[PDB]
Amino acid sequence: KDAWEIPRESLRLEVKLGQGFGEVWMGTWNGTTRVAIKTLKPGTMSPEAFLQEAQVMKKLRHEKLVQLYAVVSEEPIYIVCEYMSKGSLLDFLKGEMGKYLRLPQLVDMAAQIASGMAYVERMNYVHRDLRAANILVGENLVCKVADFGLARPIKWTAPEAALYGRFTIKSDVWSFGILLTELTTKGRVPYPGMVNREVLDQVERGYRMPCPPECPESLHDLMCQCWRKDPEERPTFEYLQAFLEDYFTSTEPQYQPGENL
Numbered sequence: 001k002d003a004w005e006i007p008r009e010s011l012r013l014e015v016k017l018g019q020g021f022g023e024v025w026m027g028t029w030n031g032t033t034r035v036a037i038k039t040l041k042p043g044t045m046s047p048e049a050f051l052q053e054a055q056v057m058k059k060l061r062h063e064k065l066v067q068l069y070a071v072v073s074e075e076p077i078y079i080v081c082e083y084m085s086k087g088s089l090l091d092f093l094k095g096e097m098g099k100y101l102r103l104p105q106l107v108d109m110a111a112q113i114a115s116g117m118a119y120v121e122r123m124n125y126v127h128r129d130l131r132a133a134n135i136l137v138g139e140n141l142v143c144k145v146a147d148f149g150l151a152r153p154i155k156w157t158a159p160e161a162a163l164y165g166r167f168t169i170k171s172d173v174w175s176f177g178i179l180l181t182e183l184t185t186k187g188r189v190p191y192p193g194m195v196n197r198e199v200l201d202q203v204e205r206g207y208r209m210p211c212p213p214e215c216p217e218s219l220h221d222l223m224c225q226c227w228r229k230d231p232e233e234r235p236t237f238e239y240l241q242a243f244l245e246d247y248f249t250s251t252e253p254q255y256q257p258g259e260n261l
């Protein structure tokens with residue numbers, strides 16, 4: 001047992017946040033630290049499989065990645081992570097607080113996410129499941145990447161990844177472009193009214209989502225860059241981070257708030 005093990009008695013599960021595989025709870029660690037806790041229902045997934053999420057988070061540490069705190073690594077297994085007080089970005093966008101978000105806030109959230117993914121990019125990892133349901137929001141609209149699908153949902157997956165299993169940082173870039181549409185539509189499902197197979201077929205034929213209402217063309221253009229057919233033609237996360245951080249000075253200095261963005 002490495003330095004990450006904690007005593008089972010040091011961990012209190014207070015409120016259940018999600019179910020599934022296992023559960024997610026808000027709780028307390030050492031009676032003083034607010035935390036998020038993921039459980040594994042014994043005999044529903046390989047312990048080695050479930051813990052893989054924790055192996056990755058021991059090596060990846062960055063202010064825009066939900067931080068690993070601790071593990072109880074024998075069945076019943078617990079993974080303890082940083083508590084993110086505002087829940088999933090997806091529920092956030094859809095809910096009462098989403099209503100009032102405007103383009104400056106939404107681009108700043110995108111820049112944060114892009115910053116976490118630039119880190120992942122520098123570390124030579126791959127996320128594989130980047131999307132708004134896997135970003136968590138904290139105090140002051142901080143957004144952090146969570147739920148690594150692995151290390152190194154067809155509507156969010158680059159075509160080369162979905163078809164041939166070629167998952168790379170560049171298929172994450174594609175997913176990020178899709179995440180940008182979730183941000184600018186307040187969390188609507190991408191490709192509205194299309195089923196998975198129609199999406200895959202149309203994306204192959206060069207189909208791409210149009211510019212969302214009130215979203216500047218310059219931001220939709222960035223989405224289009226993330227969606228280039230050739231993976232190696234897509235921008236880096238270092239590029240996306242910089243572009244989004246500088247957006248309101250370098251790209252749309254004339255931005256005026258509208259009804260929804």
Ligand SMILES: *CCS(=O)(=O)Nc1cccc(Cc2nn(C(C)C)c3ncnc(N)c23)c1
Nearest residue numbers: 018036038066067068081083084088146147
């Ligand atoms: C150590 C971070 S991790 O992504 O690898 N594992 C982990 C462990 C516990 C909880 C989460 C993600 C999560 N989900 N939710 C609700 C269900 C939307 C949370 N609320 C608050 N805080 C966190 N971390 C939440 C990830």
